[PDB]
Amino acid sequence: GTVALRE
Amino acid sequence: EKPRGFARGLEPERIIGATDSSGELMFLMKWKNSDEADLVPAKEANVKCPQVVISFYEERL
């Protein structure tokens, strides 16, 4: 449940 | 049931982010005219909206 963001 | 992802028939606006916590690469996609984003497989996004995928990568980088 981890997201790498734009950037 | 209610359609999810590309099956909603909405133009992708931008990728909010990426994750591989499920086994495969996914993108959190924002669609035009909706504030409801959902996870789509990178494998599907790569084909259906390459320029949206490339924009995400290029901004990062």
Side-chain angles (χ1 to χ4, degrees), chain A residues 1-5, chain B residues 3 5-20 22-35 37-42 44-58 60:
Chain A
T2 295
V3 178
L5 299 176
Chain B
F6 287 98
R8 298 165 63 183
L10 305 183
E11 177 181 359
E13 177 176 321
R14 65 179 209 269
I15 287 162
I16 298 302
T19 175
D20 71 348
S22 69
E24 76 179 282
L25 181 60
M26 308 279 285
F27 294 131
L28 187 59
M29 184 68 69
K30 186 184 187 299
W31 309 101
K32 302 223 174 158
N33 310 299
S34 178
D35 299 314
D38 43 17
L39 288 178
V40 297
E44 179 171 29
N46 291 348
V47 174
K48 290 190 177 162
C49 56
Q51 299 312 313
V52 170
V53 172
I54 286 171
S55 296
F56 174 70
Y57 288 130
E58 276 184 337
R60 298 173 46 93

